[PDB]
């Protein structure tokens, strides 16, 4: 797999930005958002997998993602935690 963040379709990010309510959406903004989301994903995945290896288990549990999102500072609803 390569450039799946680029594989995140530009019209999808167009929907994201319009849901953000921006008037004008540009390819420069598209790639910048791709990069920022990649950074955030890398952080959250690093923390979550750190929890996962801690859990002495091989699979990833959603509760682990709840914990990691708490650790980043953005708590999540719907599963517990």
């Amino acid at each position: 797999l390569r450039d799946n963040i680029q594989g995140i379709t530009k019209p999808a990010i167009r929907r994201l930005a319009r849901r953000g309510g921006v008037k004008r959406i540009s390819g420069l903004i598209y790639e910048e958002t791709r990069g920022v989301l990649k950074v955030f994903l890398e952080n959250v995945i690093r923390d979550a997998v750190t929890y996962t290896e801690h859990a002495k288990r091989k699979t990833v549990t959603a509760m682990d993602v709840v914990y990691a999102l708490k650790r980043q500072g953005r708590t999540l609803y719907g599963f517990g935690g």
Binding site: T75, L76, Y77, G78, F79, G80, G81
Partner: protein
């Protein structure tokens, strides 16, 4: 673990003309967990800053006053006073 049935009871008492979805139940439960952890951690940290281990209700009330905004906090304080008064009577 779940607060589910109590959530149903309270919902009926506050909104009988209403149902609640499983995912809505989930979010309710998670929110209750979040607020419970916030209040419990604040209460314990305050208790240690007291140097006193015992958890009296006043630690809870001061922590709640710290967390919620003012008027909502005052409503909560009133509810807590009512509850503790009823239990003392009971």
């Amino acid at each position: 673990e779940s607060y589910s049935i109590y959530v149903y009871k309270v919902l009926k008492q506050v909104h009988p003309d209403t149902g609640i979805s499983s995912k809505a139940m989930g979010i309710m439960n998670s929110f209750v967990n979040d607020i419970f952890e916030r209040i419990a951690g604040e209460a314990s940290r305050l208790a240690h800053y007291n140097k006193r281990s015992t958890i009296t209700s006043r630690e809870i009330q001061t922590a709640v006053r710290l967390l919620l905004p003012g008027e909502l906090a005052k409503h909560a304080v009133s509810e807590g006073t009512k509850a503790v008064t009823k239990y003392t009577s009971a």
